[PDB]
């Protein structure tokens, strides 16, 4: 039975979502050729703890050792910040930030392209963000999550890309992952009719090549099986009476925070 957040809960999620977005805005000037992912993670954790007075939800989660996930190129998700891993020209990099503030979580991620983009990296990132945005435009009471997942998948596949099956968006609130699962592809098992006050993420992982993935022996890092590039963007939202409100919007987003479907 899916959680419905109160107005007071939603305001706390606005606060936490803003913090998560602000980590991404803060880190941008540091994402440059030559920086290590270990350094980026320290900058993020110091900011979260010392400036935001918040906590990373990733740190210690199932034993995860770092504060943000940083995934480069063929890494799909859960990449571990490493002092030895240096960013370089052409890399596509996801930074995924989840913070807890006043008991509530905010969860967001974006791609950064380092130095001169490669055209395929830029296209993959663009299509991935566009797939998130088309899903966000669909969210309103009465729509089924199945329709949203199906639409993401059709859009991505038409570009010759694929959707990763093993990971999904999620309800979010006092818990990091709550009901429902938010699949980014069509499934007969999905039957969730949205209601005002539901809060969840949408966070498609899109591969340039085939959909299959592999987890590395570190038990964390996930890569494309074919070593094709993979990209992801994520926002946390609340369903409103006539659409949704994005809780993790950044200045560089190009979709409005409040989406209304009323006349
Ligand atoms: N950073 C995230 N944003 N949305 C998620 N589902 C995220 N997953 N995060 C993690 C972070 C560390 C470990 C794991 C785990 F699932 F592998 F345990 C998941
Ligand atoms: Co996330
Ligand atoms: Co998430
Ligand atoms: Na990637």
UniProtKB/Swiss-Prot annotation:
It comes from the Bacteria. One of its GO terms (biological process) is proteolysis. Keywords: Aminopeptidase, Hydrolase, Metal-binding, Protease. One of its GO terms (molecular function) is ferrous iron binding. Binds 2 divalent metal cations per subunit. Has a high-affinity and a low affinity metal-binding site. The true nature of the physiological cofactor is under debate. The enzyme is active with cobalt, zinc, manganese or divalent iron ions. Most likely, methionine aminopeptidases function as mononuclear Fe(2+)-metalloproteases under physiological conditions, and the catalytically relevant metal-binding site has been assigned to the histidine-containing high-affinity site. Changing residue 96 to A/E/N: Reduces activity 50- to 580-fold depending on the metal ion bound. Binds only one equivalent of the divalent metal cation with affinities identical to the wild-type enzyme. Its cofactor is Co(2+); Zn(2+); Mn(2+); Fe(2+). PANTHER family: METHIONINE AMINOPEPTIDASE. Removes the N-terminal methionine from nascent proteins. The N-terminal methionine is often cleaved when the second residue in the primary sequence is small and uncharged (Met-Ala-, Cys, Gly, Pro, Ser, Thr, or Val). Requires deformylation of the N(alpha)-formylated initiator methionine before it can be hydrolyzed. Monomer. Belongs to the peptidase M24A family. Methionine aminopeptidase type 1 subfamily. This is Methionine aminopeptidase. It comes from Escherichia coli (strain K12).
